């Protein structure tokens, strides 16, 4: 009867949390937003078509500036692109071609790679030996890796298939902290702009806020009803939007962690693969399985335009840190850049 | 423009050419997706530390097959099964001698029922509408003496036939063939083999050659 008593206590305390966050919402964001001017149509024509991949592209990531971005695909190539001149700087070979995540270090010195091989790979882009050489082979995850955003040059956070997130050290290869508490399979990760906290999404339709220095879930919320596979922070760090396989995008804040606004339309019944913000936070950019991309007003929940032009389902899109342009990758071995 | 920019463009063109000549051999490098139930003879089929996809490279009559054993991937299969659109075939190794015992440690579900459910899941995927299945029914040597004593009534209370080897093999054949919900664009290959039996590389060669005949009819614009 102890297990039943613990389950009843957990249920009543979760009901208390739900009642507290229900009474905490004195007003909704719609009735505050309904008296401001709307954003016009975002007629964002394509500018750069980074041809060169020979297989399906799953991940991309920008740098601290524009003009440099990395991409991963099942051809075993981790291509770093020169964005303005359409050039490619490096074509990094991969030991395992099963890749679905890649990231670019803020120092510009390292790149991440991982996937169904359950091993994170760190490559050294700047070396006296003239090549791209692997530096640290991060092992210790029993599931497939899905997101490998860089904290800094020495700390790396990995979202993996073992229903746990891990924070590693490059020089030792060991997990400093392990983030446990996700019941479902985990395929999302995004770090805060001030580099203090991070969020992660899983199959249980729950996005959990974690702390890096001590390693436990500070806050969570379940508003989705399907698998969550896209997460990113608002540029101020006090909100984050959620992308799922539910044909809806949902906005949660870091202060109350409730349903601020949903971004769903009747004409779209396809899942979301990637979600990113502009640097002002007014425009929310969401990938889709409808073979295109849609931009969303993060305040009015209105469609500000469609980034159509991809021959297949898009899988990765990122916005530059100066808000310059967005590079949407897709399954058609293309990487279009939109301004 | 600048000599820096011109040399950068030349370097980009050179690595484009290198990437093209490295990816042109990926069409020749044909790929296979091997999966099935646990301890179903999958370990003895591959003879003819990442803790993930086991990569085995073998060739037969200059075709360069690749097998992707996903037996070490215990995560949710729905979120990584879409990485195998371009695979040419699926190898499904299941054991005929695993019909009467359910787990050999507990009593909740038969291994053959779980194998049937896994085959129905992997055959009716929306990613494998046109991906042929090379079904393997191995360890027939252990199935010879395991059928004279224990009939099919333990596994199926609907058989009502003859307790013999050939009719049992044909009935398992009929069960596995009816799991295909669309026989027009999908063709399932089943081979009878043992743990110490040859003529499996010939069977997979015949399967892959038939699928690439279908592909060469497809790109020419006929099929």
């Amino acid at each position, epitope marked *: 009867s102890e297990l039943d008593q613990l389950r009843q206590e957990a249920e009543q305390l979760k009901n208390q949390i739900r009642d507290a966050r229900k009474a905490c919402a004195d007003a909704t964001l719609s009735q505050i937003t309904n008296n401001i001017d709307p954003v016009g149509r975002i007629q964002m024509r394509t500018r750069r078509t980074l041809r060169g991949h020979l297989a399906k592209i799953y991940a991309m990531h920008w740098g601290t500036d524009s*003009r440099l971005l990395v991409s991963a695909s099942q051809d075993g190539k981790l291509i770093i692109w020169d964005s303005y001149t359409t050039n490619k700087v490096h074509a990094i070979p991969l030991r395992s071609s099963w890749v679905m995540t890649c990231a670019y270090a803020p120092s510009g010195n390292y790149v991440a790679c991982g996937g169904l091989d359950n091993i994170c790979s760190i490559y050294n882009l700047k070396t006296r*030996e003239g090549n791209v050489r692997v530096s640290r082979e991060l092992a210790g995850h029993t599931g497939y890796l899905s997101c490998c955003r860089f904290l800094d040059d020495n700390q790396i956070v990995t979202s993996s298939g073992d229903t746990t997130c891990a924070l590693w050290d490059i020089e030792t290869g060991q997990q400093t902290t392990t983030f446990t508490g996700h019941t479902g399979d985990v395929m999302s990760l995004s770090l805060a702009p001030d580099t203090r906290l991070f969020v992660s999404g899983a199959c249980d339709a729950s996005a959990k806020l974690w702390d890096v220095r001590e390693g436990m879930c500070r806050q969570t919320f379940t508003g989705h009803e399907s698998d969550i596979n896209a997460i990113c922070f608002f540029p101020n760090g006090n909100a984050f939007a959620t992308g799922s396989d539910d044909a809806t995008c949902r906005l949660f804040d870091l202060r109350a962690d409730q349903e601020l606004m949903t971004y769903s339309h009747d004409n779209i019944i396809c899942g979301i693969t990637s979600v990113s913000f502009s640097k002002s936070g007014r425009l929310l950019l969401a990938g889709y399985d409808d073979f295109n991309c849609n931009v969303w007003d993060a305040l009015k929940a209105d469609r500000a335009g469609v980034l159509a032009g991809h021959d297949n389902r898009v899988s990765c899109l990122g916005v530059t840190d100066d808000g310059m342009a967005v590079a949407t990758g897709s399954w058609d071995s293309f990487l279009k850049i939109w301004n | 423009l600048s000599a820096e920019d011109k040399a950068a463009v030349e370097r980009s063109k*050179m690595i484009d050419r290198n990437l093209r000549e490295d990816g042109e051999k990926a069409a020749r490098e044909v790929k296979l997706l091997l999966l099935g139930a646990g301890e179903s003879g999958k370990s003895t089929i591959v003879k003819q530390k990442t803790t993930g996809i086991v990569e085995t490279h073998f060739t037969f009559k200059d075709l360069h097959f690749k097998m992707f054993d996903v037996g070490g991937q215990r995560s949710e299969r729905k979120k990584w099964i879409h990485c195998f659109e371009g695979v040419t075939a699926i190898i499904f190794c299941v054991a005929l001698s695993d019909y009467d015992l359910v787990l050999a440690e507990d009593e909740e579900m038969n291994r053959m029922h779980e194998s049937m459910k896994l085959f129905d899941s992997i055959c009716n995927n929306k990613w494998f509408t046109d991906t042929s299945i090379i079904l393997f029914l191995n360890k027939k040597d252990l199935f010879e003496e395991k059928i004279k004593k224990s009939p099919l009534t333990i596994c199926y209370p609907e058989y009502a036939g003859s307790n013999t080897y050939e009719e049992a093999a044909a009935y398992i054949q009929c069960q596995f063939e009816d799991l295909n919900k669309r026989k027009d664009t999908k063709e399932i290959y089943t081979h009878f083999t043992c743990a110490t039996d040859t003529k499996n590389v010939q069977f997979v060669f015949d399967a892959v050659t038939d699928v690439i005949i279908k592909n060469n009819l497809k790109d020419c614009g006929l099929f």
Partner: single-chain antibody, 232 residues
């Protein structure tokens, strides 16, 4: 990462010598190589340039059609065929490696060099000053001029600074303007916009003595400046 020289020596005028350089410790196939001379009493001047994969070959106006540069990527070596040598070809031949992409540092390594003795328009760079007095712990700002603007539409300024210690190869310090090379201590503040460019040392050291050269990489030939020695 070090370059090993071979060949050279005494040759009759009008003859030939198979000048070669054997690379080691780095990926030779991805580096665009060079050859840079240095007369026994004068400064540096660019001779030839072979790109990655031998796809682009350039020479100076004085060696156009007279010298042949070749590379062996599988054999990991670099050659230079010198035809009809004269007394104006008596210099010290250096081998220089470079890769050109975004953020790369060309001219980042120089060989030890080999000697060749023979018996008896272009954007010029001028170093107006030469052999300045200097003291340790002080700050000196040497400058060199150009005959043309060295800033294209891409926005970056193409100035290459080299320090040559006595008895040592030239060492890259400032590969592009306001950019510091790897392994160089963070006290060399290269600057200059438009026509005039300069190098600044915050605190001089004993190992900082030598002769400085500024090189432009905007067109060809990659002609150098004069010498700017340091006298204690």
């Amino acid at each position: 990462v070090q370059l090993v020289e071979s060949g050279g020596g005494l040759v009759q005028p009008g003859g030939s010598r198979k000048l070669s350089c054997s690379a080691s410790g780095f990926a030779f196939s991805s580096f665009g190589m060079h050859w840079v001379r240095q007369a026994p009493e004068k400064g540096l001047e660019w001779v030839a340039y072979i790109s990655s994969g031998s796809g682009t070959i350039y020479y100076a106006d004085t060696v156009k059609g007279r010298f042949t540069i070749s590379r062996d990527d599988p054999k990991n070596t670099l050659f230079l065929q010198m035809t009809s040598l004269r007394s104006e070809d008596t210099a010290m031949y250096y081998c220089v490696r470079s890769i050109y992409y975004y953020g790369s540092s060309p001219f980042d390594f120089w060989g030890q060099g080999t000697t060749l003795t023979v018996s008896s328009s272009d954007i010029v760079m001028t170093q107006a000053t030469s052999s300045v007095p200097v003291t340790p712990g002080e700050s000196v700002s040497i400058s060199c001029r150009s005959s043309k603007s060295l800033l294209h539409s891409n926005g970056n300024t193409y100035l290459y600074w080299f320090l040559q210690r006595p008895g040592q190869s030239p060492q890259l310090l400032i590969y592009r303007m306001s950019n510091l090379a790897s392994g160089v201590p963070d006290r060399f503040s290269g600057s200059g916009s438009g026509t005039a460019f300069t190098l600044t040392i915050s605190r001089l050291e004993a190992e900082d003595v030598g002769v400085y050269y500024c090189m432009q990489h905007l067109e060809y030939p990659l002609t150098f400046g004069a010498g700017t020695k340091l006298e204690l």
